[PDB]
UniProtKB/Swiss-Prot annotation, chains A, C, F:
Belongs to the aerolysin family. One of its GO terms (cellular component) is extracellular region. Its main location: secreted. The keyword Signal applies. Transmembrane segments: none annotated. The gene is hlgA. GO terms for biological process: cytolysis in another organism. SUPFAM superfamilies: Leukocidin-like (SSF56959). Pfam families: Leukocidin. Toxin that seems to act by forming pores in the membrane of the cell. Has a hemolytic and a leucotoxic activity. Keywords: Cytolysis, Hemolysis, Secreted, Signal, Toxin, Virulence. This is Gamma-hemolysin component A. It is found in: Secreted.
């Protein structure tokens, strides 16, 4: 099964997103059609920033990536999406359930005679957690779209949900914006640094109906905003979900299925 | 053994249902028939509809409660379904039975001497098993020319509460499946659990991955037809405030969306071609 | 070791049972005789149904498969059963046993002096359970018969035995027959949907004494019946074991050991 | 190395005992003799007989308590039994010895002062091992021309009660092996534990799977005889009501059923043929 | 596929920083470009400075709090960074939720009767995860021609105390990272935890082991330049006695030492040669 | 990839240190330069000794190896250190953290009614310990130096730190020096016997600029000293860290990269 | 690579010490010297002597407390010891530090209201490690022409008591290593623990399994000499009754038995021949 590989790499200065894309043309002679494996990698900066509100400098704002956006799409009618990873799965958990009884007797030199009776129940559920969960948000024959969503985080007082409004806020350790929020060592890599996507799509292409197709690969972020300020000897914290949505870069690749040539057509934004 | 591959796809953009079919035609010299391994994948959207947050005393949401997939040949043709995956699981669990006994005595010295004797018998049982939000079992209509699966909502945990299902019934609070608070001082449309707390398959997309093995007589037709159906059953989950507490109810398959596609199978040339499609919208 | 494969598939509309049979003729040149590996698969519907009693509509009946029946038999004197799977096995269990003592002393500023003495014993037995247990019910040189029997089930208040008469019954959630019994999500797949058998037999055949043999493969069910009704503000539950026995379909296959040909002769019922 | 395979079978339809013998003849050039690997499988029914439910004050049942298999050659021939499986187990178990000590003191302050000192020494032992309903050990009659096995009832659990065996003896209640209730207000024939609660081998069928390796001199007879015996020992388990409580008793090998088959082994042509059979019914 | 290997090195003896670069040039006929796998190893000293033991009321030490590595090509050349290791971890942990309930009653008998009952509801959660003294995450400046990593002080345990970090803040005692005793009757320069109790990377040497994969156009220059930077950020940790208790403070990147080296890469002949170096000492 | 092996072995009587060195010339035709894998093994005696102080015979001294010294160095500008093992690593630990609550009620026939409320927290950290930790103390293109340092030791009543001043001292079991210190069976092998080093370095060598290089391999010890004596019916223990440092033997090897010849040039001390 | 094997043996029937030496001569074309892998096995009896049961107030036994093996070449020859096994262990153990905190309050209702508050802080440490009756470490005399090992009594458990060693010292009861009872009303020669309770190596036979790798110069002598020594140190363990309690004492290497054998190694023909032997009996 002969493979013909091509690579393309490009960065959006504006959004601080880097697409690292591998294109593997698969010449499977047992297969009815042209085939292409697209490996979608790279780096999407978290772009986590801390600032003072303009109009209200006393109010402190942390902007951070709640969700990372990844998709691959086409308009070419000759092209089909025939496989993709990862896919959505049915969640699983280990369960342990216990039922018990105790029946006791006793004698004392009071003198007294004592009886006793007892019943116990317990259930334990056990499961794996990820900082960010990866979900297929839509897919069809022409494309697929994923969302990598903030889920749950390890904190010194247990796990905390990403949807908890007091998240990342802290009792200020100084006057600056940063000090109103938890330090770097309490932030997950996907917020402290960013996301390294790893997605894959297999695409077929009908023969004898044209040599060229166009692929749109979109990387991006949905930023949340967390606000903190001090009033009346107490800390007030608030949260804006979907504060800045679809902060996305779209790169258009042109694929020639016959010459096995791959060109970058355009990028938005730069 | 010789192997021939191809693929076919079909979209229902309206229902957000999509079929990816992968075909492996196997010519096996030790076998008197043609073999076809057929992998069914793609997308079936849950059809999830958020509740209206403005709803006050009464509210409702729709959720993807069951997914049905089926693969069939025609009654008049020579094509049989000889094998498939997954099959119905004869479930296994681990049991621990413990019997325990303690006996003891105490003594105390003061002005006056005192004493005592304590004795007790403990017994218990622990069971260990796997719990899944949705369960996959075969369709009862499965036969020699048809295999189908039901991927159905099974064990759904609210928070520490549950597990709940499509028919969960508390005598007072009804079906608490997605009920947030029994006595919550909030809008009905805001008294559902958080979307993110709902199982992936109820609110997002199901990605099926089924397999079938079909056989075809060499003296049969060069071409035959295989019918693949992707379907979602949407349940109406609703809650209401009676003045004192909140109660819930789940109405099953209150909405249905079905995507049937028929494919022309060319057994001679090892090609496959989408022939017909059928998009059926049912509503109660 | 050359193999010659044949397949047959057939369904009994009447009983909702499907036989998926693979026949593998084994040409082992190190072996003294003809050989045949019969792989017995398919689907046996549970046929679980809920209804109102005719004479007494207030009485609610759940009919369900207690046991699944599988067998393979022959009359050909030239044929021997030389292997089969699964076979009956000796059950095994992990045991953990503990013996201990405690000897305590104490002082109080009453003042008083206290003594203490204690003895503890505990035993834990640990083992695997299946929803349905598979047993060889009879076998000889001309055939073998299995029964796949309801054993034990996971319930939210511990495991329950299949022979528990109150099984599956519940406090009615409505007037219909179905509502008097536990929901689908509390039923095992072997009751909610049905059974996918997986059985194997190896058969030998003497040479030079005839080319043809007849095999009878029987799939089926033994249905139990569970009754529920409301009297005096209370639920009365009863159970009939072996309510409907040997609900079986028999398929006759003709095997030509020389031409390696396999034909379906007949089916009862249709 | 050259390998030749064959099979032979023999049925006792009356006793529901059946023998499947699988033969692997090995010509090994590095070895001065003929080798025969012989797998013994098939069926030995337990001979289980249900109790009469109509029995009132006294009742009895029969159960398969032990299975005996043996494989032999003849004293006058050149055929030896050189190896076999399974062999007797030098059993292993895991042990945990724990010694523990706690010491502490307490204080309480009010108008008037109070105090105390508490100290305890714990010690214990835990043992971990495998428990099987039936146990397989070699027959004492095993020798250079004979191997035999006894698959005997070993550790049988009533419910949480047991383990019981063929000789279990309580001074008052006797052998409680299959006794349901000590003080049960029921018919004797209904005061046995449920059939399904009984171990598989006591009530159903034993499926042996034994192996033997036999050697034969090249200068010996072209043909020799191997004798294979399948046998069940059935125990009489009985219970009775003395007016106050129930008691039980187990009578061993109160019934016996034996199936002996002799096979002609053709070492030259690597064929095997059933020669003679012997069906022996013993009753006390 | 053809593979060509070489190595290059560069030392900053002054900073005790050293670069070992290992190069694998891959000619892959299925690929339209030149490939370069580049492993970056060697040494970056922590720059650790012991505190003065003679310091009385106030004292300070310097420790290696963060290490930065980066690999780059030039904006004007055809050389891209297509892959690397390690990548940012989407962290995983295990959760165990337990809900429990006990209910019971007691009785006692004398001249006069007595009684009671006890009932309790337990619930709990356990989380299981990996904890590392220093954490490695990607530099935000990473792009199509540059990859960089920050190996930063993460979770540092004093003794049973912590975990602490660069920004740990107690309202009274400040940053207790390396503070030995809150109320210690000792010299400030002797009230730091033992050197050996400090994490390896804070006091000793970091040994990086990073990987990068670079691509080069075949129509591009025969020779190009890759820039590799090894850097340490040293933090000023200080403690002081206010008369009543000890308090601590950590000042980040109060000192910096950077070792930048540029290598000439000969894509045609598969040779590599150290071209330029840059040793930068920053101090606050 | 052809390998050309040479070995050298030598002992310093004075220090009781033995160098067992394997030299593997690696002729990798895919590689730009000459290559040499130096495997540094052998035996460094602990030289643990027990003595009476000269001036004060009542004071008992145990001298023991706190650290073992290992290094390899060169002056040849044509030679580069391109790999070495082991390297310094980031320590890792398993953490388990638990948060819980209890809410109880109770009733008594006094009569009384009782309530209860409770909160629990626990954290468990779990990690591996070595008697001696191996650290890279310095390395560059011309060499590398390791220190194998006393870390932690198993004793009754828990683990003890190597830096604990009362270490190894005991209530005297006699008048001799040895009796004031723990027996051999309570000492780790690295103190009771000594250290068997296992270190590796890969070295490159530029071609056409000279055939010969010189390598200095240094094995050695840093001895601590523990003092014990009896005063006032009580034991006084003291400790001198770095009592005897750099008790080292240095062996000079000459390597001819063309003839693949390896000679011992010198040894200090003998 | 070419391999040549041989074996040599040597017995000291008197001491019940026996040497089995297995030799692998390796001709390796990539190596400028001759290689010899030498496995040393066989038997060294413990020299165990049972105590006299008739002994009343005082008694003694002898036990194998340490085993020494060594392999050597001659100072004048070209044969070096380049490698061996086993080597000294840098021991590893697992540590678990747990910190815990509980806080709670209670309330109760009567005529008068009552209350309370409970709070506590737990901490602990668990260590996990392997314990062996006898320990193997290298001889301090090991050098470039000699390797030796000491297999010494290490951690010996009486019953639940111990672990004890050669120098164990209780201020009153002395060394309790094999002392059965502190206050036993029995004969001294019957107040030792049961023989079977003693570790295997103290009372039975040590079976060494050591390995060494030796190198030989090609320009050296065709023939050289290797010296292999097997040795046992026997300790005198004694107990005595002082009138009130039993006390014990262990005297080390109170007896010694040594078996030294010299073998002629023919490097050219790959033969080995026992040359000389030396049997030394030491007694204190």
């Amino acid at each position: 099964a002969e493979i013909i590989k091509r690579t393309q790499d490009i960065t959006s200065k504006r959004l601080a997103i880097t697409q690292n894309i591998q294109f593997d043309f698969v010449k499977d002679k047992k297969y009815n059609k042209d085939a292409l494996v697209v490996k979608m990698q790279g780096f999407i900066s978290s772009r986590t920033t801390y600032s003072d509100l303009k109009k209200y400098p006393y109010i402190k704002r942390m902007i951070w990536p709640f969700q990372y956006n990844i998709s691959l799409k086409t308009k070419d009618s000759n092209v089909d999406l025939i496989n993709y990873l990862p896919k959505n799965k049915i969640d699983s958990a280990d369960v342990s359930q216990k039922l018990g009884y105790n029946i006791g007797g006793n004698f004392q030199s009071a003198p007294s005679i004592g009886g006793s009776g007892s019943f116990n129940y317990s259930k334990t559920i056990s499961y794996n957690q990820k900082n960010y969960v990866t979900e297929v948000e839509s897919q069809n024959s022409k494309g697929v779209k994923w969302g990598v969503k903030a889920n749950s985080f390890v904190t010194p007082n247990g796990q905390v949900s990403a949807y908890d409004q007091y998240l990342f806020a802290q009792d200020p350790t100084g006057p600056a914006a940063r000090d109103y929020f938890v330090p770097d060592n309490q932030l997950p890599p996907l917020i402290q640094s960013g996301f390294n996507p790893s997605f894959i799509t297999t695409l077929s292409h009908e023969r004898g109906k044209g040599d060229k197709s166009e692929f749109e690969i979109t990387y991006g972020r949905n930023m949340d905003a967390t606000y903190a300020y001090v009033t009346r000897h107490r800390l007030a914290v608030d949260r804006k979900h979907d504060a800045f949505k679809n902060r996305n870069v779209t790169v258009k690749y042109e694929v020639n299925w016959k010459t096995h040539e791959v060109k970058i057509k355009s990028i938005t934004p730069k | 053994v010789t192997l021939y591959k191809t693929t076919a796809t079909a979209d229902s953009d309206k229902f957000k249902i999509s079929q990816i079919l992968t075909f492996n035609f196997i010519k096996d010299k030790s076998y008197d028939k043609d073999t076809l391994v057929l992998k069914a994948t793609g997308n079936i959207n849950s059809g999830f509809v958020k509740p209206n947050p403005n709803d006050y005393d009464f509210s409702k949401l729709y959720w993807g409660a069951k997914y049905n997939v089926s693969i069939s040949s025609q009654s008049n043709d020579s094509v049989n379904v000889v094998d498939y995956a997954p099959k119905n699981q004869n479930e296994e669990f681990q049991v621990q039975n413990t019997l325990g006994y303690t006996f003891g005595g105490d003594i105390s010295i003061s002005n006056g001497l005192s004493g005592g004797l304590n004795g007790n018998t403990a017994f218990s049982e622990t069971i260990n098993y796997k719990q899944e939000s949705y369960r996959t079992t075969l369709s009862r209509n499965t036969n020699y020319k048809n295999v189908g699966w039901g991927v159905e909502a099974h064990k759904i945990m609210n928070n520490g509460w549950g597990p709940y299902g499509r028919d969960s019934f508390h005598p007072t609070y009804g079906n608490e499946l997605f009920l947030a608070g029994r006595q919550s001082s909030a809008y009905a449309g805001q008294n559902f659990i958080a979307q993110h707390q709902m199982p992936l398959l109820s609110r997002s997309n199901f990605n099926p991955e089924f397999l079938s093995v079909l056989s075809h007589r060499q003296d049969g037709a060069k071409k035959s037809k295989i019918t693949v159906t992707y379907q979602r059953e949407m349940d109406l989950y609703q809650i209401c405030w009676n003045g004192f507490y909140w109660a819930g109810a789940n109405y099953k398959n209150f909405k249905t969306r079905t995507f049937k596609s028929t494919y022309e199978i060319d057994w001679e040339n090892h090609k496959v071609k989408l022939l017909d499609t059928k998009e059926t919208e049912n509503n109660k």
